[PDB]
Write an enzyme that holds these catalytic residues in place. Structure first.
Site, PDB file in Angstrom:
ATOM      1  N   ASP A  37       0.844  -1.205   0.000  1.00  0.00           N
ATOM      2  CA  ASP A  37       0.000   0.000   0.000  1.00  0.00           C
ATOM      3  C   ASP A  37       0.874   1.249   0.000  1.00  0.00           C
ATOM      4  OD1 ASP A  37      -2.076   1.882   0.299  1.00  0.00           O
ATOM      5  OD2 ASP A  37      -2.609   1.254   2.366  1.00  0.00           O
ATOM      6  N   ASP A 224      -1.048   5.726  -5.345  1.00  0.00           N
ATOM      7  CA  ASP A 224      -1.587   4.839  -4.222  1.00  0.00           C
ATOM      8  C   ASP A 224      -2.010   3.391  -4.647  1.00  0.00           C
ATOM      9  OD1 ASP A 224      -2.686   3.760  -1.944  1.00  0.00           O
ATOM     10  OD2 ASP A 224      -4.457   5.090  -1.961  1.00  0.00           O
TER      11      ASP A 224
HETATM   12  N1  LIG Z   1      -6.212  -2.971  -7.282  1.00  0.00           N
HETATM   13  C1  LIG Z   1      -6.462  -2.941  -6.162  1.00  0.00           C
HETATM   14  C2  LIG Z   1      -6.803  -2.932  -4.761  1.00  0.00           C
HETATM   15  C3  LIG Z   1      -7.975  -3.655  -4.307  1.00  0.00           C
HETATM   16  C4  LIG Z   1      -8.265  -3.658  -2.954  1.00  0.00           C
HETATM   17  C5  LIG Z   1      -7.378  -2.952  -2.111  1.00  0.00           C
HETATM   18  C6  LIG Z   1      -7.668  -2.837  -0.676  1.00  0.00           C
HETATM   19  O1  LIG Z   1      -8.497  -3.512  -0.124  1.00  0.00           O
HETATM   20  N2  LIG Z   1      -6.970  -1.895  -0.024  1.00  0.00           N
HETATM   21  C7  LIG Z   1      -7.111  -1.513   1.282  1.00  0.00           C
HETATM   22  C8  LIG Z   1      -7.905  -2.206   2.203  1.00  0.00           C
HETATM   23  C9  LIG Z   1      -8.024  -1.685   3.455  1.00  0.00           C
HETATM   24  C10 LIG Z   1      -7.385  -0.506   3.777  1.00  0.00           C
HETATM   25  F1  LIG Z   1      -7.569   0.038   5.007  1.00  0.00           F
HETATM   26  C11 LIG Z   1      -6.656   0.188   2.839  1.00  0.00           C
HETATM   27  C12 LIG Z   1      -6.037   1.487   3.203  1.00  0.00           C
HETATM   28  C13 LIG Z   1      -5.288   1.152   4.472  1.00  0.00           C
HETATM   29  F2  LIG Z   1      -4.577   2.300   4.802  1.00  0.00           F
HETATM   30  N3  LIG Z   1      -5.071   2.011   2.265  1.00  0.00           N
HETATM   31  C14 LIG Z   1      -5.419   2.879   1.356  1.00  0.00           C
HETATM   32  N4  LIG Z   1      -4.468   3.346   0.503  1.00  0.00           N
HETATM   33  O2  LIG Z   1      -6.637   3.384   1.125  1.00  0.00           O
HETATM   34  C15 LIG Z   1      -7.730   3.027   1.990  1.00  0.00           C
HETATM   35  C16 LIG Z   1      -7.159   2.581   3.339  1.00  0.00           C
HETATM   36  F3  LIG Z   1      -6.602   3.749   3.820  1.00  0.00           F
HETATM   37  C17 LIG Z   1      -6.510  -0.327   1.588  1.00  0.00           C
HETATM   38  N5  LIG Z   1      -6.322  -2.257  -2.565  1.00  0.00           N
HETATM   39  C18 LIG Z   1      -5.975  -2.244  -3.846  1.00  0.00           C
END
Ligand SMILES: N#Cc1ccc(C(=O)Nc2ccc(F)c([C@@]3(CF)N=C(N)OC[C@@H]3F)c2)nc1
Ligand code: NA
Ligand code: NA
Length: 381
Positions: A37, A224
């Site tokens: 992430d 991101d």
């Molecule tokens: N392609 C793709 C893709 C699909 C799902 C996921 C996913 O579940 N991510 C995810 C899931 C839970 C999370 F809690 C996050 C956080 C954690 F900080 N990170 C970011 N940056 O934003 C939202 C949130 F702040 C990402 N990520 C990428």
């Protein structure tokens, strides 16, 4: 430098569930799959038997675990976790051949955080201390890795989509030249918190949105890998979909679709990519008055949805969405490119990914230089 064979293909995932890398924590080593992430800065792993989890960190089995006697409560817009802070020995088996003592948040309670049916059990936040929780004194993993080893202060990501299972490469400590074509073009990291960049112009099929460019970065724009969509500030999203609607009006779609509120389906092997426009972001360049442009295809912003039990056709989700947090260049953008997080020189590089999904007529593109004046006006304060 330039050749990192052992790290190529070290990411896995399922469409919609993100990209993870295998890590080990503790002694003896416990294997865990960990979401990569670049939009957060905590290393946080499930540490209790949540039923969605294939496995979890069992601090009692580790002789090297040191408790920090400190809890942390981390809510996001969607969901939340709470955990207990500690440090332990961490390695990446398909990453550099080193072990580091890192902060780990052992997740002891979570809501709407883990994905039912996914294969990962924690998140590796690769952004900077300024946004670590509880505060900036909790040194993020990547800072510990560079502080404690000779690993160079950079990493790069090639995220490969599909049209099932995703994959790609996280190269820790360098760039691998077989992962991209053409040249890398670099954009300054504007402030080290998120990987914040500055968008200077946006075109939909070479037609400019023609907004005060402060609008493209209100209140920030970031790179991101932990978000799926390209998110656009509300005002810019409004302009962008109206322009994309117009470019594609040779077919009609329900209005729900442009809001990511319904899916749209075609007969298998008949997706009409041709009616959808390419979308270009121009980014601030390295040199005064110089920018460069990245371009994505409908293949990046129309995401397949399988396990759709209305029907067995080819169904897609519109993955550009409005934002209240600024622009977010998620996986919709990264899947087109090889992205180099060149933390040593505070800059992010883009090149055309060797693995991006395309067709016979159009490919994703990274082109420069362009002359763009007043680019410093585009950042929001
Ligand atoms: N392609 C793709 C893709 C699909 C799902 C996921 C996913 O579940 N991510 C995810 C899931 C839970 C999370 F809690 C996050 C956080 C954690 F900080 N990170 C970011 N940056 O934003 C939202 C949130 F702040 C990402 N990520 C990428
Ligand atoms: Na070092
Ligand atoms: Na190359």
């Amino acid at each position: 430098r330039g050749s990192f064979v052992e790290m190529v293909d070290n990411l896995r995932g399922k469409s919609g569930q993100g990209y993870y890398v295998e890590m080990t924590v503790g002694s003896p080593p416990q294997t865990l799959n960990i979401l990569v992430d670049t939009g957060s800065s905590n290393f946080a792993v499930g540490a209790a038997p949540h039923p969605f989890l294939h496995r979890y960190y069992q601090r009692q089995l580790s002789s090297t675990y040191r408790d920090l006697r400190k809890g942390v409560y981390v809510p996001y817009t969607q969901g939340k976790w709470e955990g207990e802070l500690g440090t332990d020995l961490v390695s990446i088996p398909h990453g550099p051949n080193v072990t580091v003592r890192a902060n780990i948040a052992a997740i002891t309670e979570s809501d709407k955080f883990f994905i039912n049916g996914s294969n990962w059990e924690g998140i590796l936040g690769l952004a900077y201390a300024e946004i670590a929780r509880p505060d900036d004194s909790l040194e993020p993993f990547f800072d510990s890795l560079v502080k404690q080893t000779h690993v160079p202060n950079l990493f790069s990501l090639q995220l490969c989509g599909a049209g099932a299972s995703v994959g790609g490469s996280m190269i820790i400590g360098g760039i691998d030249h077989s992962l991209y074509t053409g040249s890398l073009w670099y954009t300054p990291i504007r402030r080290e918190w998120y990987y914040e960049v500055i968008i200077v112009r946006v075109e939909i099929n070479g037609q400019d949105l023609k907004m005060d460019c402060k609008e493209y970065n209100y209140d920030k724009s970031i790179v991101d890998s932990g978000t799926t969509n390209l998110r656009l500030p509300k005002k810019v999203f409004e302009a962008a979909v109206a322009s994309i609607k117009a470019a594609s009006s040779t077919e009609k779609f329900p209005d729900g679709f442009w809001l990511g509120e319904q899916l749209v389906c075609w007969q298998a092997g008949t997706t009409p990519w041709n009616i959808f426009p390419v979308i270009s972001l121009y980014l601030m360049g390295e040199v005064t008055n110089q920018s460069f442009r990245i371009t994505i295809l409908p293949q990046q912003y129309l995401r397949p949805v399988e396990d759709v039990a209305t029907s067995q056709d080819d169904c897609y989700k519109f993955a550009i969405s409005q934002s209240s947090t600024g622009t977010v260049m998620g996986a919709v953008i990264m899947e087109g490119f090889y992205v180099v997080f060149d933390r040593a020189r505070k800059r992010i590089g883009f090149a055309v990914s060797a693995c991006h999904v395309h067709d016979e007529f159009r490919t994703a593109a990274v082109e420069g230089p362009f002359v763009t004046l007043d680019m410093e006006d585009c950042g929001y304060n």
